[PDB]
Design a binder for this molecule. Structure first.
Ligand SMILES: Nc1ncnc2c1ncn2[C@@H]1O[C@H](COP(=O)(O)OP(=O)(O)OP(=O)(O)O)[C@@H](O)[C@H]1O
Ligand SMILES: [Mg+2]
Lengths: 209, 234, 96, 239, 250, 238, 240, 240, 232
């Protein structure tokens, strides 16, 4: 198994998408939040069904995304209390390595709060590789600005070195946010070229509110 | 899921003391042998980087003119125990004017082990029991004496002791090469054989340390010049 | 009627688990597993299985065909000491 | 009188608070220290200045005496109190035994204080790791490294703070007798080591050099430029 | 007794500690003040929070306190704790004058108070202090000085600083528009007015909604002044006029 | 089970569990026997050791000329109590110039060890003292327990697998009223021989004997002059 | 739940649970009776024979707190001993402070307040023994008092504590105790003890009797051996 | 309604309440007794009931009335031990006031000091707030008789006629209806009203061995306990 | 014995003191009260209402004079108000014993707020449950102050605290001004206390105190009866 953890918005889902892209096996996706339900004895049914259909097809890849959502929020529609969540977790925890031969299925899961979930869930034999995703560095920030402005018709007046030092610890998603917002605000006036003052107001719009 | 530091287990043993007993297994090995001729102590160092200064890290440290100590487990805290040992010996010499047996010093120290008390007094050496295991070697009027002391507060005289991470194997192998007609040189040689056999890395004249005490002279330890004599003569 | 209990392996347990989970390996013929048993004080059968796997992966990483002692030492250095902040056993020996 | 135990043994034999303090130190700014036959050099990086700070109130290198210097990684709240206690001890030393204080003595004193702070009640462990550099009497310049758990060592060269593994791996494969043959050689070695770490594009390095003669000699923002330029020229000619 | 404890001193598995973090999140809101220094005289601007129509408006000061003949400080956070700290440092300075018969340097006073503050997060099991405050002064060793404090205990010397709710924008815009050693007590004020304008969402910069304090050096006075409300509105309209000219020009 | 974490709490059945746990800890030690004749008291202890090349742990301690004790439990608390015993006996001798009678001392011990079982966050003392002494009223045998409770006895045995020895003592109870030291000690050893499995027994390196009497001060015999007592003993029937 | 942990928290229905647990701890002791006569009082204790090794006279459950006041206890022995010691110390302190034997109505109150101090704070636990005090004075008559863990002191013509409190007090009340002097009371007590604790529950036990009144110059002490011999011989006939 | 430790210690609930005090008030009713106090034109009267379930109990030592001072009397409701502790505290405080100031304590100040002492308990997190309620009657010069009441939460007040116990509400209703008559009051009227109020609330038609009465008058301020004979006289004269 | 030695009020994940807020919510449910001042003196009005006719309303008071010229009233919890009044009395005596001069009101308020705040950082306690209104007349200019369980203090021209206090604030805004008389002040205060008064208003259910540049006094029932008359 593989779990990917780190601060928010640094490309966990993106790497998942790319892996789905190149691969040849069937890819099954489900978000952790809708594992919970509104009746008794339903969550376990859902998990049994999911893994059954997964092994029904072929060598396949399952993606479980934002697991921590089950273990941090409470919703009134949930008829049971916090014990049914425990029941669901026991079922999922058995699916990976229970009394019966697994077959040919891989598992990939990701979260950004790894200090809340049950350590019994992570023991080797149910998940082996844990990969951590740190914040971008100045070299990577330069590469990121280079990538996200490919097909942009931009004027040489701008200096990216200003925006590299724009924030103390800006994350990866702020990059694409800045690019798209500035593009929108220049296209406001039916124009094709983007100037520097445009970024000067765009970063302020997106970073401060 | 939270209990005080003074709780008894459903089978009668304490909690903190058992955990410390399990914790002294993370330290380096150490072997001590007592012979009517004298007492010898040997220890490893676990050098990790070539920028180490091997002479900076030491294990055997003298307590007086005729008492030596070998330590295993954690190290940072043992300094307090060694200090109290030395101060007690000098206080006894000042008050009464003679030299003390290693046994009296051993129990005088051991009475200090069980003191952690969450409530009551002013600052105490509270919080936790100490995590070190000690070998005491001395020469008194009744010949050479070797004692072993443990985090629980129990001390006992032994003939061939091995403490540390690789304690079991050393103890198992040591029984078949000891008897009462032992001599110093062959004792040191056998000890070196055992250490090199259970070592992790390679053996040289800087990865180990020895010390010996005989009734004649005082506590004396070898340097990098007389240490390789037995290495080449293995 | 019976309350069989399974505890963490002692020492013959560790060397013997190594013998079992590594007997299908293409590795060096002159390495000793007892040192490997000594290097991991309280660990489960799972960790031994994962150590075998990760040493094989270190050998396949570069180019080699058969693994050696350095692979095992590095694998132990990483799956035992580097991952140890995601371990159950410090909170499942007080039985909760 | 808040009296309650804090650091308690774990079921398998660890001191979890000490592990947490070490993991806290492992996320501070990077510091490096090396010694030579006459001059000992220690430097720090990643200043991250916003051109509105007065450098005299942000510097993390302070002098315990006229012959001892500190560098540290961790959190900056506790450094001043540790340093102040150390200075008080140094001064109190001279009033008794006349001779100036040795560096190893101060290392033992600090280590013992930090350790005994883990046995009391209602006191969390300290979260700093420091390098103590000094040229004692008899001319034997030396550095010592301190740990939060309270274990001290005598080294030849160290790097603490963020990214210690890379800087070390650089050091053991590039430190030889010839590298410390000359003073400019040693300064070049340290500048090269720090440059192979966190970016710090020239303007984010602070160095300090002892020539075994007198007190602190902080180099102005001039020799850094010349050293960087000649390092670049040597790199260009070598390849 | 242990079943009811909260542990306001332990570390965390991730390395940091949570009490000061929560204190910082709370200190983030509730108030706005900033300080600027470029030449002889230093300025503090504070946005008033209690501005209802039913206030007596007395004591001459609500967030500006004298500490010595040349020491003044603002504050943000919980007010009562601020009273505690100000009273505590007052006799610190008085005892320094008692001991040495000489006005105290600023940095020593700041360091002493920071030690007092940090002692609470080292041990004792109490909640920390939720106060962030500034310091301005003059001394013979280094002339004019400005300083910022932090509930954790760390401090530093600065030239332009904001602590208010929208301090981020204040820092960004002070970064891009400043002059080294030229902004006398005539040009910095307009910049401060416009900065405060951008910080507060309410426009027109109500005269009663802001307060300004200035420190100047004099041979035997060391003048500390708080200019009245008959001279703020002229500054506001002067800024409005220059901005109107710049607006119409482009 | 939350009723099992501190001394102060009371279980619904009215049994504090800490004291039960301490008793259980006392049952962990090695066996030991004690008994009295008309004018002599004898206590016998069987030792233990870990590896064949380590010395045996000692059990019997010397308190005062007319008072000896035997210990089962963990040793640190044992020393902590013995120091108190020495201190009090010396104080009584210094002030009133007379041996301290055994019962008054035992009452002092009970009152002393009762205090921790009532405050908050204080553990009990884990020891199983057996007190043997001689006073103006003759011999005395007493037993204490971690629950700050003591009993007066004429023949008692404590430690792991002490039950069979207690049954043997109960069977041959009467004859202690006419025997002398020679056969008294032999009876004590016969009693102790039952608490061992079917492979190993007494070898003179695992036995320690303490005797006090009307005209003999409290004496300890161990590992040397013990052979005179042991020899002449009939073998275990099988 | 969790309302029964400490002795500082009220249950929702409005009562403290730890004290109730303590009283249930008392209700497993053996048994003790004390009754007042014309000119004195008589205690009576039955001591179970746990095993043959112990001696007679061991672990006395009757304590003579002062030269003229007797005490009988039921519960945990250690707590009983500690309370006995504090009562004795209080009596001596009072004699030294003022200079005459303390009356009951004051000594019982002092012990009761000291006990009640152990049911408020969470740093201590409540006691686990319930006891009886008796005495006689020539100028004051015969006094009997009973005290429980909660801290209540009451006066009785005659009472009983232990397992079979109800069964015993059934036959306590039949006797006409208002007049007949306590020389024939002793036979009644032996009879009333031998009619409880059937042989099925246990085989054998022993009996203790105490004595106080002007019949012995007001002092408090133990009964002679021949008297209890005669009383036991008499009570042997009541089984018919 | 609650979260955390509002149900275990005296800390504020999210809605502004606090429960560890509200529980003591219902802890009051555990004994199962009731008392009534009336203030007349120049007299003050208190009536209480006593219950003796068995003959073995000495009927002369269950009085709930206590004599604080030669001019001030108190009556008790609730648990027993806490009651005794509070009584002793009051006696000690009055004696200290006399030592310090040299003249008698007015009733109001004494009640204030005892209630203030109670108030600290509901401020910290170690103690229990003492579930037992207090009634005081006295005479003050230039003010006539005065009647005051003190509760566990610390709220003291001076009334004209009060009742404490299980049946507080209906008794207060009856007293209100009666006092609305707006007429003069004499000793016989006060005693008759106080008796008949409790009599009709419980509907017993009792005997002179079940009720205790305390009075004070402005002719002889010494608080006194009525003898059974004159109690019988009042009782039979009431029934026309 | 021994206390607990660790504070029970700690910062929440959003950085909000929970306990002091709950204390304020409890304060809001107390008896209403209002306070006014206009150029010649200060007036405090508050409402009291016993549950039944048996209570002797002549035995307790709400308005308590600290000294001859300082007045105090409260809104909220019952008992601890007395503790605070006692502490204020003590502080007044302590100050007068140094400078031989009556305390200015501002200093008294500062000290009282100091105590109230200090009480929330100590060990094993919970804060008070009261809101205080302080009035005084020193150096000609009258003064009014209002404290708070958090310890912050303000100066108000006229305010209202208790049930439905927001409506009292709005009404006072729509009526209060800067130049008036003491008598008109009393009338308008009584009127605003009648906004949500009980079933009927009598002379004993309202407590009013005044303080002019001549001193602080509590008004007897006669003048309360007269003022309630010729009103409403
Ligand atoms: N290293 C990177 N290279 C390119 N794009 C990046 C990088 N890091 C972040 N991004 C951009 O940031 C966006 C946010 O990443 P993503 O949506 O995968 O978030 P995430 O890491 O799963 O976190 P979260 O749980 O907060 O959604 C990506 O769509 C991508 O455009
Ligand atoms: Mg995502």
């Amino acid at each position: 198994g593989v779990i990917l953890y780190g601060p928010p918005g640094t490309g966990k889902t993106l790497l998942a998408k790319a892996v789905a892209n190149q691969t040849s096996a069937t890819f099954l996706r489900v978000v952790g939040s809708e594992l919970i339900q509104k009746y008794l004895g339903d969550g376990p049914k859902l998990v049994r069904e999911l893994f059954r259909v997964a092994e029904e097809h072929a060598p396949s890849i399952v993606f479980i995304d934002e697991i921590d959502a089950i273990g941090t929020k409470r919703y009134d529609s949930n008829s049971g209390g916090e014990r049914e969540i425990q029941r669901t977790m026991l079922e999922l925890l058995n699916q990976l390595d229970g009394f019966d031969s697994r077959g040919d299925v891989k598992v990939i899961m990701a979260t950004n709060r790894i200090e809340t979930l049950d350590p019994a869930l992570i023991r080797p034999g149910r998940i082996d590789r844990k990969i951590e995703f740190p914040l971008p560095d100045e070299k990577t920030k330069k590469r990121i600005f280079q990538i996200h402005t490919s097909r942009m018709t931009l004027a040489d007046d701008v200096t990216l070195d200003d925006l590299i030092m724009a924030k103390d610890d800006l994350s990866g998603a702020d990059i694409k946010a800045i690019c798209t917002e500035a593009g929108l605000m220049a296209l406001r006036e039916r124009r094709m070229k983007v100037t520097n003052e445009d970024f000067k107001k765009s970063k302020e719009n997106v970073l401060y509110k | 899921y939270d209990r005080g530091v003074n709780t008894f287990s459903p089978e009668g043993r304490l909690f903190q003391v058992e955990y410390a007993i399990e914790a002294i297994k993370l330290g380096s090995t150490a072997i001590g042998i007592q012979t009517s001729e004298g007492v010898c102590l040997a220890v490893e160092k676990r050098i990790t980087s070539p920028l180490m200064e091997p002479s900076s890290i030491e294990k055997i440290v003298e307590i007086d003119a005729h008492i030596g100590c070998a330590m295993s487990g954690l190290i940072a805290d043992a300094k307090t125990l060694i200090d109290k040992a030395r101060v007690e010996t000098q206080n006894h010499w000042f008050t009464y004017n003679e030299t003390m047996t290693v046994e009296s010093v051993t129990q005088a120290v051991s009475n200090l082990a069980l003191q952690f008390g969450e409530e009551d007094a002013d600052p105490g050496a509270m919080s936790r029991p100490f995590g070190v295991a000690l070998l005491f070697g001395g020469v008194d009027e009744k010949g050479p004496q070797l004692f072993h002391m443990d985090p629980s507060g129990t001390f006992v005289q032994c003939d061939a002791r091995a403490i540390g991470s690789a304690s079991e194997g050393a103890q198992s192998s040591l029984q078949e090469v000891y008897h009462k007609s032992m001599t110093l040189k062959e004792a040191i040689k056998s000890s070196l054989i055992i250490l090199k056999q259970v070592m992790e890395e390679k053996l040289n004249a800087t990865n180990i340390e020895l010390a010996t005490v005989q009734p004649g002279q005082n506590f004396h330890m070898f340097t990098k010049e007389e240490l390789e004599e037995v290495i080449k003569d293995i | 009627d019976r309350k069989i209990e399974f505890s963490l392996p002692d020492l013959e347990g560790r060397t013997h688990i190594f013998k079992i989970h590594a007997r299908s390996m293409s590795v060096e013929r002159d390495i000793r597993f007892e040192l490997l048993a000594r290097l991991c004080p309280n660990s489960t059968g799972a960790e031994i299985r994962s150590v075998c796997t990760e040493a094989g992966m270190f050998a396949i990483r570069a180019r080699r065909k058969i693994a050696t002692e350095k692979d095992f030492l590095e694998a132990v250095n990483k799956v035992i000491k580097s991952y140890a902040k995601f371990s159950a056993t410090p909170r499942y020996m007080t039985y909760n | 009188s808040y009296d309650r135990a804090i650091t308690v043994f774990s079921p398998d034999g660890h001191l979890f608070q000490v592990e947490y303090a070490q993991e806290a130190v492992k996320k501070g700014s990077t510091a490096v220290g090396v010694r030579g036959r006459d001059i000992v050099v220690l430097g720090v990086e990643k200043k991250s200045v916003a051109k509105l700070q007065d450098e005299r109130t942000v510097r993390k290198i302070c002098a315990l005496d006229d012959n001892v210097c500190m560098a540290f990684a961790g959190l900056t709240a506790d450094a001043r109190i540790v340093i102040n206690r150390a200075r008080v001890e140094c001064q109190s030393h001279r009033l008794t035994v006349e001779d100036p204080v040795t560096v190893e003595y101060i290392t033992r004193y600090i280590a013992s204080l930090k350790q005994r702070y883990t046995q009391s009640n209602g006191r969390r462990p300290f979260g700093i790791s420091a390098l103590i550099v000094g040229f004692d009497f008899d001319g034997t310049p030396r550095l010592y490294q301190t740990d939060p758990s309270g274990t001290y060592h005598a080294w030849k060269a160290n790097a603490i703070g963020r990214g210690a593994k890379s800087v070390r791996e650089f050091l053991e494969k590039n430190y030889t007798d010839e590298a410390i043959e000359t003073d400019d050689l040693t300064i070049k070695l340290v500048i090269k080591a720090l440059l192979e770490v966190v970016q710090s594009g020239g303007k984010n390095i602070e160095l300090a050099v002892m020539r075994r003669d007198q007190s602190l000699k902080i180099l102005n923002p001039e020799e850094i430029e010349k050293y960087v330029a000649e390092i670049e020229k040597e790199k260009e000619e070598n390849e | 007794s242990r079943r009811y404890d909260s542990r306001t001193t332990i570390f965390s598995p991730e390395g940091r500690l949570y009490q000061v973090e929560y204190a910082m999140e709370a200190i983030g809101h509730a108030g706005t003040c900033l300080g600027i220094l470029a030449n002889d005289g230093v300025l503090l601007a504070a946005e008033r929070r209690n501005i209802h129509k039913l206030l007596d408006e007395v004591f001459f000061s609500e967030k500006i306190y004298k500490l010595n003949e040349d020491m003044a400080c603002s504050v943000a956070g919980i007010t009562s704790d601020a009273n505690v700290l100000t009273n505590e440092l007052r006799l610190i300075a008085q005892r320094y004058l008692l001991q040495y018969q000489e006005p105290i340097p600023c940095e020593q006073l700041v360091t002493a108070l920071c030690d007092i503050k940090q002692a609470y997060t080292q041990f004792g099991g109490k909640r920390p202090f939720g106060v962030s405050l500034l310091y301005i002064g003059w001394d013979k060793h280094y002339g004019f000085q400005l300083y910022q404090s932090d509930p954790s205990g760390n401090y530093g010397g600065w030239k332009a600083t904001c602590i208010g709710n929208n301090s981020a924008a204040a820092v960004s815009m002070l970064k891009q528009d400043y002059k080294e050693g030229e902004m006398t007590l005539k040009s910095a004020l307009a910049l401060a007015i416009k900065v405060l304008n951008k910080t507060m969402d309410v426009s027109k910069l109500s005269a009663e909604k802001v307060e300004i304090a200035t420190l100047t050096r004099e041979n035997g006075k060391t003048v500390i002044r708080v200019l009245k409300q008959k001279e703020v509105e002229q500054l506001i309209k002067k800024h409005e006029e220059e901005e109107a000219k710049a607006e119409r020009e482009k | 089970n939350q009723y099992d974490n501190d001394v102060t709490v009371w279980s619904p059945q009215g049994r504090i569990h800490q004291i039960e746990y301490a008793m259980e800890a006392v049952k962990q030690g090695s066996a030991t026997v004690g008994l009295k004749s008309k004018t002599h008291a004898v206590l016998v202890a069987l030792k233990r050791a870990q590896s064949e090349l380590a010395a045996h742990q000692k059990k019997i301690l010397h308190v005062d000329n007319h008072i000896g004790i035997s210990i089962a439990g963990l040793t640190a608390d044992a020393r902590l109590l013995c120091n108190f015993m020495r201190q009090e006996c010396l104080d009584s001798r210094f002030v009133f110039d007379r041996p301290l009678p055994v019962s008054r001392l035992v009452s002092l011990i009970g009152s002393k060890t009762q205090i921790p079982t009532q405050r908050y966050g204080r553990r009990p003392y884990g020891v199983g003292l057996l007190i043997a002494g001689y006073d103006d009223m003759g011999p005395h045998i007493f037993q204490t327990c971690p629950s700050a409770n003591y009993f007066d006895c004429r023949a008692m045995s404590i430690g792991a697998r002490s039950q069979s020895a207690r049954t043997y003592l109960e069977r041959h109870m009467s004859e202690f009223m006419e025997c002398n030291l020679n056969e008294l000690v032999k009876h004590g050893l016969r009693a102790l021989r039952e608490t061992l499995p079917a492979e190993q027994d007494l070898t003179t390196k695992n036995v320690s004997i303490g005797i006090v009497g009307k005209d003999l001060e409290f004496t300890i015999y161990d590992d040397d002059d013990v052979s005179p007592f042991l020899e002449g003993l009939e073998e275990r029937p099988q | 739940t969790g309302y029964d942990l400490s002795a500082s928290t009220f249950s929702p229905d409005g009562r403290v649970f730890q004290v109730e647990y303590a009283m249930k701890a008392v209700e497993n002791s053996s048994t003790a009776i004390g009754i007042r006569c014309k000119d004195g009082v008589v205690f009576g204790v039955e001591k179970l024979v746990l095993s043959k090794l112990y001696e007679e006279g061991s672990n006395k459950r009757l304590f003579n707190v002062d030269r003229h006041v007797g005490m009988a206890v039921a519960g945990l022995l250690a707590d009983a001993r500690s309370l006995a010691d504090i009562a004795r110390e209080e009596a001596s302190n009072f004699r030294s402070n003022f200079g005459y034997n303390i009356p009951l109505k004051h000594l019982a109150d002092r012990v009761a307040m000291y006990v009640h101090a152990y049911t408020l704070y969470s740093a201590v636990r409540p006691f686990g023994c319930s006891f009886m005090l008796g005495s006689y004075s020539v100028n004051d008559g015969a006094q009997l008092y009973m005290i429980d863990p909660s801290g209540v002191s009451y006066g009785y013509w005659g009472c009983a504590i232990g397992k079979a409190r109800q069964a015993a007090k059934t036959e306590i009340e039949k006797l006409q105790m208002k007049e007949m002097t306590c020389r024939d009371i002793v036979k009644e007590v032996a009879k009333i003890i031998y009619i409880v604790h059937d042989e099925v529950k246990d085989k054998a036990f022993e009996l203790e009797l105490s004595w106080v009144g002007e019949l012995t110059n007001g002092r408090h002490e133990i009964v002679p051996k021949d008297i209890r011999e005669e009383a036991e011989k008499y009570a042997k006939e009541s089984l018919k | 309604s609650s979260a955390g430790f509002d149900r275990h210690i005296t800390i504020f609930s999210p809605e502004g309440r606090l429960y560890q005090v509200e529980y003591a008030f219902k802890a009051i009713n555990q004994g199962g007794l009731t008392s009534v106090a009336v203030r007349g034109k120049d007299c003050a009267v208190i009536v209480t009931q006593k219950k003796v379930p068995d003959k073995l109990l000495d009927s002369s030592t269950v009085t709930h009335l206590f004599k604080i001072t030669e001019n001030i009397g108190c009556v008790m409701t609730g648990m027993t031990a806490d009651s005794r502790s509070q009584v002793q505290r009051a006696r000690y405080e009055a004696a200290n006031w006399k030592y310090k100031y040299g003249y008698e304590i007015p009733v109001d100040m004494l009640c204030k000091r005892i209630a203030d002492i109670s108030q600290v308990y509901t401020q910290n997190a170690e103690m229990r707030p003492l579930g037992c309620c207090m009634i005081l009657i006295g005479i003050d010069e230039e003010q006539g008789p005065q009647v005051y009441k003190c509760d566990p939460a610390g709220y003291y007040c001076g009334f004209k006629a009060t009742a404490a116990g299980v049946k507080q509400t209906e008794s207060t209703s009856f007293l209100e209806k009666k006092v609305k008559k707006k007429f003069d009051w004499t000793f016989e009227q006060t005693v008759e009203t106080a008796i008949t109020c409790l009599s009709t609330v419980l509907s017993i038609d009792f005997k002179p061995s079940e009720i205790e009465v305390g009075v004070v008058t402005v002719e002889n301020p010494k608080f006194r306990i009525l003898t059974e004979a004159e109690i019988d006289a009042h009782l039979v004269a009431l029934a026309e | 014995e021994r206390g607990y030695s660790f504070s029970l009020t700690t910062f929440s994940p959003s950085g909000k003191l929970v306990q002091i807020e709950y204390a304020l919510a409890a304060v809001a449910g107390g008896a209403p009260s209002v306070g006014i001042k206009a150029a010649n003196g200060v007036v405090l009005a508050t409402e009291k209402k016993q549950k039944s006719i048996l209570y002797d309303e002549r035995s307790v008071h709400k308005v308590e004079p600290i000294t001859k010229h300082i007045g105090l009233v409260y809104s909220g919890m019952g008992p601890d108000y007395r503790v605070l009044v006692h502490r204020a009395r003590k502080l007044a005596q302590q100050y007068y014993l140094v400078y031989q001069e009556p305390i200015p009101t501002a200093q008294l308020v500062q000290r009282v707020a100091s105590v109230m705040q200090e009480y929330t950082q100590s060990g094993g306690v919970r804060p008070f449950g009261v809101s205080l209104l302080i009035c005084g007349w020193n150096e000609g200019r009258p003064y009014l102050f209002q404290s708070d369980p958090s310890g912050a203090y303000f100066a108000w021209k006229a305010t209202a605290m208790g049930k439905n206090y927001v409506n009292g604030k709005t009404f006072l805004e729509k009526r209060y001004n800067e130049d008036l008389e003491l008598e008109d002040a009393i009338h308008t205060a009584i009127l605003t206390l009648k906004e949500s008064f009980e079933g009927q208003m009598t002379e004993d259910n309202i407590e009013v105190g005044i303080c002019n540049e001549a001193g602080f006094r509590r008004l007897t029932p006669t003048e309360v009866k007269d003022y309630l008359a010729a009103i409403a």
